Amino acid sequence: VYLDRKLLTLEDKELGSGNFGTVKKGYYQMVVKTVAVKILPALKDELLAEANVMQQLDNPYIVRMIGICEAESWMLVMEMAELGPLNKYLQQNRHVKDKNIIELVHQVSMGMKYLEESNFVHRDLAARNVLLVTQHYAKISDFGLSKALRADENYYKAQTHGKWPVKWYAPECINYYKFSSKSDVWSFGVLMWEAFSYGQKPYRGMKGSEVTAMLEKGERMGCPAGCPREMYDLMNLCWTYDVENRPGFAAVELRLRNYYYDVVNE
Description:
It is found in: Cell membrane; Cytoplasm, Cytosol. The protein has about 270 residues and is α+β, with helices and mostly antiparallel strands.
């Protein structure tokens, strides 16, 4: 968990950015391991809570944390996903096949099912935060807003409105500041829409308040060009307004699993 600055080599190749600072490529002497390194009072605590979350997670479809390091700045060292964010990948690879997209989103649902079973809420589940190891292997990243649910609660209640990916959030998150695995299922439906639309932003041209209003009229994003009906149906089921009737990830993962090898068989 605590790592040696001596065994880390940072390259000059930036992989990400944000309010936190920067994400750079690097090498860690184990064989050496190629790593993505998140480099940074508020920030440090957020970084440490993130690391403390990833450390508890063990699944093939979640990005693994190598550990943390206090050098020049606080730094969080993760496994590298060489093909990078899913949205960018699909934007520059417009010919990826439909079967292939189904395979990737099914993988993310296997990861989220695990997260659900582990009682963690992700709270930033978007195509940008799905990283490709190869063309056929997706992992979930960015646990910076994520929460371990208390043993007696099925949701996390935020005290104030943070800096939030509002177009990926469910009505109970916007309205009640309440975040559950089911809230992540809503996010998942948007992420699926992004994937089948080859990395286009959702609710394009629209402010957060206009999205809220659209969602309130019972309106929903249209079906992406070339997107299978069964997958748009699943999207729409993820966008069930009422948290109580919206599926969980076990249900969502099974739907995808089944449809995926219907297709694989075709």
